[PDB]
Amino acid sequence: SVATGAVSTASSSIPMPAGVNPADLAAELAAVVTESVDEDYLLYECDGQWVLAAGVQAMVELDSDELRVIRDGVTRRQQWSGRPGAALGEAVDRLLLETDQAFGWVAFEFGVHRYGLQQRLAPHTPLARVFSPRTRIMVSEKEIRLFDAGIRHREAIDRLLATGVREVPQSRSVDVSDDPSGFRRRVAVAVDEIAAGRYHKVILSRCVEVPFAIDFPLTYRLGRRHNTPVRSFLLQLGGIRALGYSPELVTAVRADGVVITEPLAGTRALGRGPAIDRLARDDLESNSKEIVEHAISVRSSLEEITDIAEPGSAAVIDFMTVRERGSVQHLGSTIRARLDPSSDRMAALEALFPAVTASGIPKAAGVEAIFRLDECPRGLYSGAVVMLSADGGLDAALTLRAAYQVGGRTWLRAGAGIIEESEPEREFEETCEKLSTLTPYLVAR
Ligand SMILES: [Mg+2]
Ligand SMILES: [Mg+2]
């Protein structure tokens, strides 16, 4: 599972009691374990394992202008040039010499350097934050595994197993029908650029301000019982709080060399009744426009994966099937390959980042159009939440279907892939469908 190879603990597992849900226990642990000590954390769900990385032992901060390594209140600064993946990889490999796993996030802006667009970034633009935790607690349906977990973490687990998790309170509604960023006018500009032949597709997005503060662990729990994401996360790291139900896996690199990527394209609503959802499912599977965009994205994923894979190892093992993602359903393909000996996990991330779902087609022209037609910098939105291991593992989830809090600002953000035949009204409605992954499940603070 996640706990394989170098990711190991000699500690005995605690068996999971019968009616206890792992997402609820892990999110409650994140709230309790860090409230009493005011410490940062990242909860990452990966293949049935909810990994709670609690406390910051060491932090790697990659900005557009410098790289910092912070440990025990001491900051080491350094200038960097060239690929941001090479700079981040070198600093994170040093963290992983002392600990078996590292966690964090990668901003959308991390992906602009491969296209020669980094000079458009403002000074001190955040690119990545990756830390090694003080403690890890892995929760699954079967058991709870502890990695360097003290008496305090054990007492917290024991109290939650004895009393049970908190009841999730009532949710508070938010209106997403307003368009203060002029998303529909920005879509019409992109449609005219595509008609003029500048590019084939660009992903544009809009922010939705939440007019009240939310409780991130309780909102995470409520939304997770109504969603089926590929990965999910809940974090409090520095100045940002975030939660999300990642619909798409940018890349998974295992220590045994297997590389996985799972591109998505096309969207229909889900959760509106069985017969209506099955009409939308049949429409999505047979719709010419959605099929063309899905095949063009698979062709792009195969090109990027071929650059970092052993020759003849790239393979589509699941092609163009409907993937259900709570309030929406999409076309998805699963691509598998073997990491070439001349390549590494950071090079694999750099080849597959940004996702087509975050940029466009061709990816270089989509990223350039996003600088002009979307609210920049995007930050965490359309970037990735990552988990790395000492033996070469990397798991990167696309940061979509997420909520954020920085300062007093709480917001949601959703986008749509705009093509030549796009109608601004249908693209706006598609952002509402994607926003419905979280809007009925916001628990106020
Ligand atoms: Mg190539
Ligand atoms: Mg589209």
Author numbering: 5 to 449
Paper lines:
The salicylate synthase MbtI from Mycobacterium tuberculosis (Mtb, the etiological agent of TB) is the first enzyme involved in the biosynthesis of mycobactins. These small-molecule siderophores are capable of chelating iron, a key cofactor involved in several mycobacterium-specific biological processes. MbtI has been structurally and biochemically characterized;2 it is essential for the survival of Mtb under iron-deficient conditions, and, as such, it has been identified as a promising therapeutic target. MbtI belongs to the group of structurally homologous Mg2+-dependent menaquinone, siderophore, and tryptophan (MST) enzymes, which transform chorismate by rearrangement, to generate precursor molecules for the respective biosynthetic pathways.
Considering the inherent difficulty in obtaining MbtI–Mg2+ cocrystals and the results of our biochemical assays, we hypothesized that we could compensate for the rather low affinity of MbtI for its cofactor by using saturating concentrations of Mg2+. Interestingly, 2.1 Å resolution data were collected from a non-isomorphous crystal grown under these conditions. In chain A, the Mg2+ interacts with the oxygen of Gly421, with four ordered water molecules, and with a sulfate anion. The coordination pattern of Mg2+ in chains B and D is analogous: the ion could be modeled as directly interacting with Glu297, Glu434, and two ordered water molecules, which in turn make H-bonds to Glu294 and Glu431. The salicylate coordinates the Mg2+ ion with its carboxylic moiety, which also forms additional H-bonds with the peptide backbone through Gly270 and Gly421 and with the side chain of Thr271. As previously noted, the bond between the carboxylic function and Gly270–Thr271 is responsible for the adoption of the closed conformation. The presence of bound salicylate in the structure is remarkable, especially considering that the natural substrate was not added to the crystallization solution. Unsurprisingly, the position that was occupied by the pyruvate is here taken by a sulfate ion, provided in the crystallization solution as the Mg2+ counterion. Observing such a conformation in this ternary complex is not surprising when high concentrations of Mg2+ are present; consistent with previous hypothesis and biochemical data, the bound Mg2+ ion stabilizes the enzyme in a close conformation, which in turn prevents the loss of salicylate from the active site.
